[PDB]
Design an enzyme around this catalytic site. Structure first.
Site, PDB file in Angstrom:
ATOM      1  N   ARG A   1      -0.050   9.299   0.741  1.00  0.00           N
ATOM      2  CA  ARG A   1      -1.047   9.154   2.122  1.00  0.00           C
ATOM      3  C   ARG A   1      -0.241   8.192   3.206  1.00  0.00           C
ATOM      4  NH1 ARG A   1      -3.367   6.215  -1.758  1.00  0.00           N
ATOM      5  NH2 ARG A   1      -3.470   4.061  -1.451  1.00  0.00           N
ATOM      6  N   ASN A   2       0.645   7.423   2.679  1.00  0.00           N
ATOM      7  CA  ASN A   2       1.198   6.419   3.560  1.00  0.00           C
ATOM      8  C   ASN A   2       2.932   6.978   3.838  1.00  0.00           C
ATOM      9  OD1 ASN A   2      -0.538   4.512   4.752  1.00  0.00           O
ATOM     10  ND2 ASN A   2      -0.649   3.331   2.957  1.00  0.00           N
TER      11      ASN A   2
ATOM     12  N   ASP B   1       0.816  -1.223  -0.024  1.00  0.00           N
ATOM     13  CA  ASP B   1      -0.106  -0.050  -0.196  1.00  0.00           C
ATOM     14  C   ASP B   1       0.919   1.207  -0.151  1.00  0.00           C
ATOM     15  OD1 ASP B   1      -2.537   1.581   0.057  1.00  0.00           O
ATOM     16  OD2 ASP B   1      -2.864   1.137   1.891  1.00  0.00           O
TER      17      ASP B   1
ATOM     18  N   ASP C   1       2.322   2.581   7.369  1.00  0.00           N
ATOM     19  CA  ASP C   1       0.929   2.096   6.883  1.00  0.00           C
ATOM     20  C   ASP C   1       0.019   2.323   8.132  1.00  0.00           C
ATOM     21  OD1 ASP C   1      -0.151  -0.985   5.248  1.00  0.00           O
ATOM     22  OD2 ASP C   1      -1.284   0.507   6.068  1.00  0.00           O
TER      23      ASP C   1
HETATM   24  C1  LIG Z   1      -0.083  15.021  13.126  1.00  0.00           C
HETATM   25  O1  LIG Z   1      -0.905  13.951  12.375  1.00  0.00           O
HETATM   26  C2  LIG Z   1      -0.424  12.562  12.685  1.00  0.00           C
HETATM   27  C3  LIG Z   1       0.977  12.455  12.931  1.00  0.00           C
HETATM   28  C4  LIG Z   1       1.275  10.826  13.106  1.00  0.00           C
HETATM   29  N1  LIG Z   1       2.682  10.844  13.388  1.00  0.00           N
HETATM   30  C5  LIG Z   1       2.967   9.425  13.589  1.00  0.00           C
HETATM   31  C6  LIG Z   1       2.140   8.343  13.581  1.00  0.00           C
HETATM   32  C7  LIG Z   1       0.668   8.745  13.028  1.00  0.00           C
HETATM   33  O2  LIG Z   1       0.035   7.640  12.953  1.00  0.00           O
HETATM   34  C8  LIG Z   1       0.281   6.490  12.373  1.00  0.00           C
HETATM   35  C9  LIG Z   1       0.802   6.207  11.256  1.00  0.00           C
HETATM   36  C10 LIG Z   1       1.262   4.896  10.951  1.00  0.00           C
HETATM   37  C11 LIG Z   1       1.476   4.120  11.900  1.00  0.00           C
HETATM   38  N2  LIG Z   1       2.030   2.841  11.658  1.00  0.00           N
HETATM   39  C12 LIG Z   1       1.941   1.473  11.913  1.00  0.00           C
HETATM   40  O3  LIG Z   1       1.504   1.466  12.857  1.00  0.00           O
HETATM   41  C13 LIG Z   1       2.794   0.703  11.194  1.00  0.00           C
HETATM   42  C14 LIG Z   1       2.764  -0.817  11.308  1.00  0.00           C
HETATM   43  C15 LIG Z   1       1.866  -1.637  12.239  1.00  0.00           C
HETATM   44  N3  LIG Z   1       3.625  -1.249  10.136  1.00  0.00           N
HETATM   45  C16 LIG Z   1       3.764  -2.589   9.901  1.00  0.00           C
HETATM   46  N4  LIG Z   1       4.209  -0.341   9.374  1.00  0.00           N
HETATM   47  C17 LIG Z   1       4.999  -0.324   8.685  1.00  0.00           C
HETATM   48  C18 LIG Z   1       6.248   0.038   8.623  1.00  0.00           C
HETATM   49  C19 LIG Z   1       6.942  -0.148   7.399  1.00  0.00           C
HETATM   50  C20 LIG Z   1       6.429  -0.336   6.188  1.00  0.00           C
HETATM   51  C21 LIG Z   1       5.168  -0.911   6.058  1.00  0.00           C
HETATM   52  C22 LIG Z   1       4.330  -0.808   7.150  1.00  0.00           C
HETATM   53  C23 LIG Z   1       3.567   1.045  10.176  1.00  0.00           C
HETATM   54  O4  LIG Z   1       3.662   1.786   9.715  1.00  0.00           O
HETATM   55  C24 LIG Z   1       1.233   4.430  13.398  1.00  0.00           C
HETATM   56  C25 LIG Z   1       0.459   5.686  13.382  1.00  0.00           C
HETATM   57  F1  LIG Z   1       0.300   5.792  15.012  1.00  0.00           F
HETATM   58  C26 LIG Z   1       0.387  10.286  12.956  1.00  0.00           C
HETATM   59  C27 LIG Z   1      -1.096  10.335  12.464  1.00  0.00           C
HETATM   60  C28 LIG Z   1      -1.193  11.479  12.393  1.00  0.00           C
HETATM   61  O5  LIG Z   1      -2.529  11.957  11.980  1.00  0.00           O
HETATM   62  C29 LIG Z   1      -3.386  11.123  11.537  1.00  0.00           C
END
Ligand SMILES: COc1cc2nccc(Oc3ccc(NC(=O)c4c(C)n(C)n(-c5ccccc5)c4=O)cc3F)c2cc1OC
Length: 308
Positions: A166-167, A162, A180
Site C-alpha cells: 500500500r506504501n 510502515d 509513506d
Molecule cells: C493515482 O493515485 C495516486 C497517485 C499518487 N501519486 C503520487 C503521490 C500520491 O500521494 C502521495 C503518496 C505519498 C506521499 N509521500 C510523502 O508525502 C512522503 C513523505 C513526507 N515521506 C517522508 N515519504 C517517504 C519517502 C521515502 C521513505 C519513507 C517515507 C513519503 O513518501 C505523497 C503523496 F502525495 C498519489 C496518490 C494517489 O491516490 C491516493
C-alpha cells in the site's frame, strides 16, 4: 518538536503557487489530503503532480506535522525508487503544499490485485496475447527496485516503519517508488492498521521485536520487506489469510510460525521471504544483500525466458 524546524532551501525547493492548478482530490486522510495538479516549469513544460496539503481548519500541530514531512523528504533526497519531492509552497499568501511526482497507477497492492487475470509466469509468442500482462520478471523487478530504494533509505540513516505494498506506488515504465502517505492516510478507517493500546499499528507487517519490545530498526524494515514480497507474489493479497490478528497470532509469530508460499512465487523467492523473517534481527539479510540476491534471481529468471 522536531523535524519541521530544520533549515529550508527556498532557492532549491520553492515553487510558485500561481504556477500550480489544483484538480481532483486523489486521496483523503485523517488530517491531510493528496490532490492531482498541473504544474508549469517545475522541471517551459507542463507536468502532472501530486500535491499534499492540509484539510480546511487544520490545527497548528497538523501544520507542524506537514512541515516535518517536507523536511524529512528533503533530508532523504533523490532516488529512482523513492517518491521524489519536486517542490514546495511554504511562503506567505497560501497554504503549505508539498509537491511530489505523480504515480499514475497508484499503490502496488491494488494494482497487483487488478491484474489477477492478466498474469503469466513467462510470455509465449505471439506475445500480443499477453499484452500488458504481468510476468515473473515484473514481480522480481518490482522486488529488486524496492530493495534498492530501501538500501538507499538505510544510507540516509532512515527507518521506514510502515513498509508494505500500500506504501509502494507504481509510475510509468514499470518504475516502483517507496513512499509513506503519512498525514494523508486514514489509519483509523484502514483495516491494515490494528488498535494496540493508544495507537493504530500495521501488525501484519511488524517484526516480533517490534510487536513485543517496540524496537524499530532497519532490520525490522527487512521483516516488513519480506511481508511485501509475499504481497507481490500473491498479486496483492492480504497477509496471514483468515488468521485473527490477536495475542495468539503474536505469540505464534514469536514461536516461529510463518506464512505459507503465495500462489505466484518461485521457490527462491519464498526462501528469501523466510530469510527476511528470521527470528533473529541480526540474522536477516541486509538490504544490500537483498539487492544482490534479487539481482541474481532477476538474472536467473531471464535465462528461463530465451525465445528471443
Ligand atoms: C493515482 O493515485 C495516486 C497517485 C499518487 N501519486 C503520487 C503521490 C500520491 O500521494 C502521495 C503518496 C505519498 C506521499 N509521500 C510523502 O508525502 C512522503 C513523505 C513526507 N515521506 C517522508 N515519504 C517517504 C519517502 C521515502 C521513505 C519513507 C517515507 C513519503 O513518501 C505523497 C503523496 F502525495 C498519489 C496518490 C494517489 O491516490 C491516493
Amino acid at each position: 518538536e522536531h523535524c519541521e524546524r530544520l533549515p529550508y532551501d527556498a532557492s532549491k525547493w520553492e515553487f510558485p503557487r500561481d504556477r500550480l492548478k489544483l484538480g481532483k482530490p486523489l486521496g483523503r486522510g485523517a488530517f491531510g489530503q493528496v490532490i492531482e495538479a498541473d504544474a508549469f516549469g517545475i522541471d517551459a513544460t507542463c507536468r502532472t503532480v501530486a500535491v499534499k496539503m492540509l484539510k480546511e481548519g487544520a490545527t497548528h500541530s497538523e501544520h507542524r506535522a506537514l512541515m516535518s514531512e517536507l523536511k524529512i523528504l528533503i533530508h532523504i533526497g533523490h532516488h529512482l525508487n523513492v517518491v521524489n519531492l519536486l517542490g514546495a509552497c511554504t511562503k506567505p499568501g497560501g497554504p503549505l503544499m508539498v509537491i511530489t511526482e505523480f504515480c499514475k497507477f497508484g499503490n502496488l497492492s491494488t494494482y497487483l490485485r487488478s491484474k489477477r487475470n492478466e498474469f503469466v509466469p513467462y510470455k509465449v509468442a505471439p506475445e500480443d496475447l499477453y499484452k500488458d500482462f504481468l510476468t515473473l520478471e515484473h514481480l522480481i523487478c518490482y522486488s529488486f527496485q524496492v530493495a534498492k530504494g530501501m538500501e538507499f533509505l538505510a544510507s540516509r540513516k532512515c527507518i521506514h516503519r510502515d513498509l508494505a505494498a500500500r506504501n509502494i506506488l507504481l509510475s510509468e515504465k514499470n518504475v516502483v517508488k517507496i513512499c509513506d502517505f503519512g498525514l494523508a492516510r486514514d489509519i483509523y478507517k484502514d483495516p491494515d492498521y490494528v488498535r494496540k493500546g493508544d495507537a493504530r499499528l500495521p501488525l501484519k507487517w511488524m517484526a516480533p521485536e517490534t510487536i513485543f519490545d517496540r524496537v524499530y530498526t532497519i532490520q525490522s524494515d527487512v521483516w516488513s520487506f519480506g511481508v511485501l514480497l509475499w504481497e507481490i507474489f500473491s498479486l496483492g493479497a492480504s497477509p496471514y489469510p483468515g488468521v485473527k490478528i490477536d495475542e495468539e497470532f503474536c505469540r505464534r509469530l514469536k514461536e516461529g510460525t510463518r506464512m505459507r508460499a503465495p500462489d505466484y512465487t518461485t521457490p527462491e523467492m519464498y526462501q528469501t521471504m523466510l530469510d527476511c523473517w528470521h527470528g533473529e534481527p541480526s540474522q536477516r539479510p541486509t538490504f544490500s544483500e537483498l539487492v544482490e540476491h534479487l539481482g541474481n534471481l532477476l538474472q536467473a529468471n531471464a535465462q528461463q525466458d530465451r525465445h528471443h
